[PDB]
Design a protein around this motif. Structure first.
Motif, PDB file in Angstrom:
ATOM      1  N   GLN A  35       0.814  -1.215   0.000  1.00 22.99           N
ATOM      2  CA  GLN A  35       0.000   0.000   0.000  1.00 22.99           C
ATOM      3  C   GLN A  35       0.846   1.263   0.000  1.00 22.99           C
ATOM      4  OE1 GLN A  35      -2.936  -0.420   3.096  1.00 22.99           O
ATOM      5  NE2 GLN A  35      -4.604  -0.608   1.597  1.00 22.99           N
ATOM      6  N   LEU A  36       1.797   1.327   0.943  1.00 22.11           N
ATOM      7  CA  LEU A  36       2.634   2.509   1.093  1.00 22.11           C
ATOM      8  C   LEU A  36       3.508   2.712  -0.130  1.00 22.11           C
ATOM      9  CD1 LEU A  36       3.645   4.884   2.766  1.00 22.11           C
ATOM     10  CD2 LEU A  36       5.400   3.348   3.701  1.00 22.11           C
ATOM     11  N   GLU A  37       4.092   1.626  -0.632  1.00 26.62           N
ATOM     12  CA  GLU A  37       4.942   1.710  -1.807  1.00 26.62           C
ATOM     13  C   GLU A  37       4.147   2.179  -3.014  1.00 26.62           C
ATOM     14  OE1 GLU A  37       4.329  -0.587   0.374  1.00 26.62           O
ATOM     15  OE2 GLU A  37       5.903  -2.121   0.523  1.00 26.62           O
ATOM     16  N   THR A  38       2.935   1.645  -3.191  1.00 30.36           N
ATOM     17  CA  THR A  38       2.080   2.086  -4.289  1.00 30.36           C
ATOM     18  C   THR A  38       1.711   3.560  -4.153  1.00 30.36           C
ATOM     19  OG1 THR A  38       1.200  -0.155  -4.461  1.00 30.36           O
ATOM     20  CG2 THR A  38      -0.028   1.603  -5.546  1.00 30.36           C
ATOM     21  N   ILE A  39       1.371   3.995  -2.938  1.00 34.57           N
ATOM     22  CA  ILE A  39       0.987   5.387  -2.712  1.00 34.57           C
ATOM     23  C   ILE A  39       2.152   6.323  -3.022  1.00 34.57           C
ATOM     24  CG2 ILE A  39       0.327   7.047  -0.942  1.00 34.57           C
ATOM     25  CD1 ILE A  39      -1.547   5.102   0.196  1.00 34.57           C
ATOM     26  N   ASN A  40       3.359   5.959  -2.587  1.00 33.20           N
ATOM     27  CA  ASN A  40       4.519   6.818  -2.795  1.00 33.20           C
ATOM     28  C   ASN A  40       4.805   7.002  -4.278  1.00 33.20           C
ATOM     29  OD1 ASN A  40       5.290   7.453  -0.076  1.00 33.20           O
ATOM     30  ND2 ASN A  40       6.099   5.373   0.147  1.00 33.20           N
ATOM     31  N   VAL A  41       4.719   5.920  -5.052  1.00 30.49           N
ATOM     32  CA  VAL A  41       4.992   6.001  -6.482  1.00 30.49           C
ATOM     33  C   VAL A  41       3.986   6.922  -7.172  1.00 30.49           C
ATOM     34  CG1 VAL A  41       5.057   4.652  -8.606  1.00 30.49           C
ATOM     35  CG2 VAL A  41       6.130   3.770  -6.541  1.00 30.49           C
ATOM     36  N   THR A  42       2.699   6.806  -6.821  1.00 25.92           N
ATOM     37  CA  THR A  42       1.699   7.703  -7.397  1.00 25.92           C
ATOM     38  C   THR A  42       1.965   9.152  -7.007  1.00 25.92           C
ATOM     39  OG1 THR A  42       0.187   5.860  -6.965  1.00 25.92           O
ATOM     40  CG2 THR A  42      -0.754   7.874  -7.876  1.00 25.92           C
ATOM     41  N   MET A  43       2.305   9.399  -5.738  1.00 23.68           N
ATOM     42  CA  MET A  43       2.654  10.748  -5.308  1.00 23.68           C
ATOM     43  C   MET A  43       3.945  11.250  -5.929  1.00 23.68           C
ATOM     44  SD  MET A  43       0.275  11.945  -3.427  1.00 23.68           S
ATOM     45  CE  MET A  43       1.114  13.328  -2.644  1.00 23.68           C
ATOM     46  N   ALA A  44       4.764  10.358  -6.473  1.00 23.10           N
ATOM     47  CA  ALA A  44       5.987  10.740  -7.162  1.00 23.10           C
ATOM     48  C   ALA A  44       5.755  11.097  -8.623  1.00 23.10           C
ATOM     49  CB  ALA A  44       7.020   9.610  -7.067  1.00 23.10           C
ATOM     50  N   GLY A  45       4.518  11.004  -9.100  1.00 29.50           N
ATOM     51  CA  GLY A  45       4.204  11.265 -10.484  1.00 29.50           C
ATOM     52  C   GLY A  45       4.439  10.100 -11.417  1.00 29.50           C
ATOM     53  N   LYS A  46       4.805   8.935 -10.892  1.00 29.48           N
ATOM     54  CA  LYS A  46       5.101   7.773 -11.714  1.00 29.48           C
ATOM     55  C   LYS A  46       3.845   6.944 -11.982  1.00 29.48           C
ATOM     56  CE  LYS A  46       9.595   8.545 -10.647  1.00 29.48           C
ATOM     57  NZ  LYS A  46      10.705   8.776 -11.605  1.00 29.48           N
ATOM     58  N   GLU A  47       3.841   6.270 -13.129  1.00 23.77           N
ATOM     59  CA  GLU A  47       2.826   5.263 -13.421  1.00 23.77           C
ATOM     60  C   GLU A  47       3.077   4.007 -12.589  1.00 23.77           C
ATOM     61  OE1 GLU A  47       1.172   7.118 -15.497  1.00 23.77           O
ATOM     62  OE2 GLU A  47       2.924   8.396 -15.856  1.00 23.77           O
ATOM     63  N   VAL A  48       2.000   3.395 -12.100  1.00 18.00           N
ATOM     64  CA  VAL A  48       2.127   2.201 -11.273  1.00 18.00           C
ATOM     65  C   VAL A  48       0.934   1.292 -11.525  1.00 18.00           C
ATOM     66  CG1 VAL A  48       1.053   3.348  -9.290  1.00 18.00           C
ATOM     67  CG2 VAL A  48       2.503   1.328  -8.935  1.00 18.00           C
ATOM     68  N   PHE A  49       1.205  -0.011 -11.560  1.00 16.60           N
ATOM     69  CA  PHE A  49       0.169  -1.037 -11.558  1.00 16.60           C
ATOM     70  C   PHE A  49       0.258  -1.805 -10.244  1.00 16.60           C
ATOM     71  CE2 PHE A  49      -0.885  -1.954 -16.316  1.00 16.60           C
ATOM     72  CZ  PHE A  49      -1.371  -0.676 -16.429  1.00 16.60           C
ATOM     73  N   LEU A  50      -0.865  -1.904  -9.529  1.00 17.79           N
ATOM     74  CA  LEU A  50      -0.938  -2.668  -8.288  1.00 17.79           C
ATOM     75  C   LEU A  50      -1.805  -3.893  -8.512  1.00 17.79           C
ATOM     76  CD1 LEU A  50      -0.540  -3.153  -5.260  1.00 17.79           C
ATOM     77  CD2 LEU A  50      -2.416  -1.574  -4.836  1.00 17.79           C
ATOM     78  N   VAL A  51      -1.225  -5.076  -8.338  1.00 17.75           N
ATOM     79  CA  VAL A  51      -1.969  -6.323  -8.455  1.00 17.75           C
ATOM     80  C   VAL A  51      -2.184  -6.838  -7.041  1.00 17.75           C
ATOM     81  CG1 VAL A  51      -2.017  -8.645  -9.405  1.00 17.75           C
ATOM     82  CG2 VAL A  51      -0.922  -6.783 -10.688  1.00 17.75           C
ATOM     83  N   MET A  52      -3.425  -6.772  -6.576  1.00 12.08           N
ATOM     84  CA  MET A  52      -3.761  -7.168  -5.232  1.00 12.08           C
ATOM     85  C   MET A  52      -5.049  -7.976  -5.262  1.00 12.08           C
ATOM     86  SD  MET A  52      -3.879  -4.673  -1.946  1.00 12.08           S
ATOM     87  CE  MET A  52      -2.126  -4.425  -2.176  1.00 12.08           C
ATOM     88  N   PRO A  53      -5.155  -9.028  -4.459  1.00 12.32           N
ATOM     89  CA  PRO A  53      -6.391  -9.812  -4.442  1.00 12.32           C
ATOM     90  C   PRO A  53      -7.546  -8.977  -3.923  1.00 12.32           C
ATOM     91  CG  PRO A  53      -4.888 -10.508  -2.694  1.00 12.32           C
ATOM     92  CD  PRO A  53      -4.107  -9.639  -3.626  1.00 12.32           C
ATOM     93  N   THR A  54      -8.754  -9.334  -4.358  1.00 11.63           N
ATOM     94  CA  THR A  54      -9.949  -8.578  -3.995  1.00 11.63           C
ATOM     95  C   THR A  54     -10.103  -8.496  -2.481  1.00 11.63           C
ATOM     96  OG1 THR A  54     -10.956  -9.536  -5.977  1.00 11.63           O
ATOM     97  CG2 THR A  54     -12.362  -8.266  -4.497  1.00 11.63           C
ATOM     98  N   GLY A  55     -10.417  -7.304  -1.988  1.00 18.15           N
ATOM     99  CA  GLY A  55     -10.432  -7.084  -0.556  1.00 18.15           C
ATOM    100  C   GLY A  55      -9.086  -6.782   0.063  1.00 18.15           C
ATOM    101  N   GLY A  56      -8.024  -6.722  -0.743  1.00 22.05           N
ATOM    102  CA  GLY A  56      -6.699  -6.431  -0.241  1.00 22.05           C
ATOM    103  C   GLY A  56      -6.506  -4.987   0.160  1.00 22.05           C
ATOM    104  N   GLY A  57      -7.306  -4.068  -0.379  1.00 24.49           N
ATOM    105  CA  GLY A  57      -7.045  -2.655  -0.156  1.00 24.49           C
ATOM    106  C   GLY A  57      -6.494  -1.863  -1.327  1.00 24.49           C
ATOM    107  N   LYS A  58      -6.930  -2.199  -2.547  1.00 26.21           N
ATOM    108  CA  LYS A  58      -6.517  -1.444  -3.726  1.00 26.21           C
ATOM    109  C   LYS A  58      -7.040  -0.013  -3.681  1.00 26.21           C
ATOM    110  CE  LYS A  58      -7.942  -4.566  -6.663  1.00 26.21           C
ATOM    111  NZ  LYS A  58      -8.061  -5.672  -5.668  1.00 26.21           N
ATOM    112  N   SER A  59      -8.292   0.181  -3.245  1.00 24.81           N
ATOM    113  CA  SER A  59      -8.958   1.477  -3.392  1.00 24.81           C
ATOM    114  C   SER A  59      -8.240   2.569  -2.612  1.00 24.81           C
ATOM    115  CB  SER A  59     -10.414   1.389  -2.937  1.00 24.81           C
ATOM    116  OG  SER A  59     -11.139   0.422  -3.671  1.00 24.81           O
ATOM    117  N   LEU A  60      -7.750   2.240  -1.419  1.00 23.46           N
ATOM    118  CA  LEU A  60      -7.040   3.221  -0.603  1.00 23.46           C
ATOM    119  C   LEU A  60      -5.849   3.811  -1.351  1.00 23.46           C
ATOM    120  CD1 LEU A  60      -6.618   4.514   2.296  1.00 23.46           C
ATOM    121  CD2 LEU A  60      -5.087   2.581   2.711  1.00 23.46           C
ATOM    122  N   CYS A  61      -5.229   3.030  -2.239  1.00 26.12           N
ATOM    123  CA  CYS A  61      -3.988   3.436  -2.883  1.00 26.12           C
ATOM    124  C   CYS A  61      -4.189   4.559  -3.886  1.00 26.12           C
ATOM    125  CB  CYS A  61      -3.330   2.235  -3.550  1.00 26.12           C
ATOM    126  SG  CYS A  61      -2.592   1.084  -2.355  1.00 26.12           S
TER     127      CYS A  61
END
Ligand SMILES: Nc1ncnc2c1ncn2[C@@H]1O[C@H](COP(=O)(O)OP(=O)(O)O)[C@@H](O)[C@H]1O
Ligand SMILES: [K+]
Ligand SMILES: [K+]
Ligand SMILES: [K+]
Ligand SMILES: [K+]
Ligand SMILES: [Mg+2]
Ligand SMILES: [Zn+2]
Length: 531
Positions: A35-61
């Motif tokens: 979660q944190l790593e995905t959030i940081n990359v988005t806040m860095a202006g970078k493109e990111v793909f997060l593959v997480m199982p359903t209910g993992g917490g994708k939406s927060l990112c």
DNA sequence: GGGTGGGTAGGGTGGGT
């Protein structure tokens, strides 16, 4: 897939804002992995793909980054129901958000278009269907004005796998989504998915064109989850009585999920549990939003102990303490089973996943998935998992996914790993030949045998017109006979033949491709059995 | 109950077949 571990830190300039939003706004204690790593990359202006199982917490990112900067975030979603679930979560959290869809009113579209270019607008997340991108120039005109005004600086594509033609639920609308990065390069883009083969992700990246993109994939194995397979009783009433015994005897007062083949099954099971004192409520995406809110509100407060959901699409069931997951019927595919069983134990505490394996369920699922190209094959893999009585469940589950290598130890967290027992290889060649004699007579008699009818002839039940005088009764329990027939079907000594009737598709059993191997007298057929 | 009322459709524990 570049390593998230470089980004697993809070030394960034925005780190204070990210911590402030996570605790004060989302009321969340700790970031889940990636979660944190995905959030940081988005806040860095970078493109990111997060593959997480359903209910993992994708939406927060992508919801959290929206609140960390001025302006709104565009979210592309494929389903109106998915958009509604996010809006309800956001409304409870006090986050301003809105949606656009085909059924939205003209006045609402006018309001959303006005808010996009409004300097002081409070909107932070705008959810639109891909049709609004491909087939609405007016929305694109507002989007272009908003982009030039720096109103929005990031884009989230939920279910990003739909961009690729190979992805599940591929949408021709999702094809056009490459216009986004082409027209608004300065806006970072984040793709979220739960089912993502590597070639699917690269194709979706090509569609969006995005060129360089981080891909973060969640770890497959869940150490806290216990996986078990149990025989499904032939009647439908002792089954629910058995389930109530399990719930009261081991999970007394604990939350859990029951998965059912069909929507009516969930309603029928829900009533049966209620009459036995289990607090239960059916849930499925067919529910009206008021019903979804009430079930979710009751479940969170533990006014409802058990949620009875449908396998087909049921997936607003977010609760961190799910202590048990029970499959009233076996999952359609191993890929579905991992997603459905993975709802349990999101708090990382120990949880149980019990699958009830029934002979009848095999054909009921087979008829449904007949149009799917690999539907039978995926189901038969699920049948093999139920059949196995020695292999560790994690090893069996891992072998169905060539995309993941899982070397993690089970630590006595499955039924087979647990139980110290010894197995033989029982010969069943004679049983297979006897069933062939019953089938061959039927072909000359121009009658089709259902698996129920074929088993009846084997045991001496059913119409005497479908009998072989020389075939002796197996003198084994009926459930064991079902397993033997299932083993033959898996091995292609028997094959399913489907009849399309006006009412429904029906499965009939026929002589399999491999039956000609029985001509060799030295041929033998064996199956694992406990001693 | 009847099959020009319909079965991508209402569902089969609603009943006749
Ligand atoms: N860091 C976290 N800590 C605790 N719970 C979380 C965290 N992130 C997400 N959740 C919860 O997980 C639940 C499911 O998340 P969801 O947004 O549905 O993810 P997905 O898109 O993978 O389904 C939500 O109810 C959310 O509150
Ligand atoms: K959330
Ligand atoms: K009828
Ligand atoms: K009627
Ligand atoms: K009718
Ligand atoms: Mg989701
Ligand atoms: Zn194991």
């Amino acid at each position: 897939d570049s390593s998230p571990a470089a980004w697993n830190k809070e030394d960034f300039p925005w780190s204070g804002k990210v911590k402030d939003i996570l605790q004060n706004v989302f009321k969340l204690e700790k970031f889940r992995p990636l979660q944190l790593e995905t959030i940081n990359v988005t806040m860095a202006g970078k493109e990111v793909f997060l593959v997480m199982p359903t209910g993992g917490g994708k939406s927060l990112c992508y919801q959290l980054p929206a609140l960390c900067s001025d302006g709104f975030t565009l979210v592309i979603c494929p389903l109106i129901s998915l958009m509604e679930d996010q809006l309800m979560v956001l409304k409870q959290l006090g986050i301003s958000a809105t949606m656009l869809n085909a059924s939205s009113s003209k006045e609402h579209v006018k309001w959303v278009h006005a808010e996009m270019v409004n300097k002081n607008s409070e909107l932070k997340l705008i959810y639109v269907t891909p049709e609004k991108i491909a087939k609405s120039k007016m929305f694109m005109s507002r989007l272009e004005k908003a982009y030039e005004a720096r109103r929005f600086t990031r884009i989230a594509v939920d279910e990003v796998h739909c961009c690729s033609q190979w992805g599940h639920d591929f949408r021709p609308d999702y094809k056009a989504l490459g216009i986004l990065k082409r027209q608004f390069p300065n806006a970072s883009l984040i793709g979220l998915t739960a089912t993502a083969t590597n070639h699917v992700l690269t194709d979706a990246q090509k569609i969006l064109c995005i060129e360089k993109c981080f891909t973060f994939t969640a770890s497959f194995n869940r150490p806290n989850l216990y996986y078990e397979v149990r025989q499904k009783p032939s009647n439908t009433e002792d089954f629910i009585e058995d389930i109530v015994k399990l719930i009261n005897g081991r999970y007394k007062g604990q939350s859990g999920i029951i998965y059912c083949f069909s929507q009516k099954d969930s309603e029928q099971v829900t009533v049966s549990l209620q009459n036995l004192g289990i607090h239960a409520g059916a849930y499925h995406a067919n529910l009206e939003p008021e019903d979804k809110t009430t079930v979710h509100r009751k479940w969170s407060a533990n006014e409802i102990q058990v949620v009875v959901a449908t396998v087909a699409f049921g997936m607003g069931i977010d609760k961190p303490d799910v202590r048990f997951v029970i499959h009233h019927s076996m999952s359609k595919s191993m890929e579905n089973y991992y997603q459905e069983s993975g709802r349990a134990g999101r708090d990382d505490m120990k949880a149980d996943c019990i699958l009830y394996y029934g002979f009848g369920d095999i054909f009921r699922i087979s008829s449904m998935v007949v149009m799917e190209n690999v539907g039978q094959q995926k189901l038969y893999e699920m049948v093999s998992y139920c059949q196995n009585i020695s292999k560790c469940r994690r090893v069996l589950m891992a072998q169905h996914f060539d995309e993941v290598w899982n070397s993690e130890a089970c630590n006595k967290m499955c039924d087979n790993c647990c139980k110290d027992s010894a197995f033989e290889r029982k010969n069943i060649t004679e049983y297979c030949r006897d069933l062939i004699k019953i089938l061959k007579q039927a072909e000359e008699l121009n009658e089709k045998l259902t698996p129920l009818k074929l088993i009846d002839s084997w045991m001496g039940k059913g119409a005497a017109k479908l009998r072989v005088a020389g075939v002796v009764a197996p003198t084994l329990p009926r459930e064991d006979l079902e397993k033997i027939i299932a083993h033959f079907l898996i091995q292609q000594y028997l094959k399913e033949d489907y009849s399309f009737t006006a009412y429904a598709t029906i499965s009939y059993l026929k002589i399999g491709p491999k039956a000609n191997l029985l001509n060799n007298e030295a041929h033998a057929i064996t199956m694992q059995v406990t001693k």
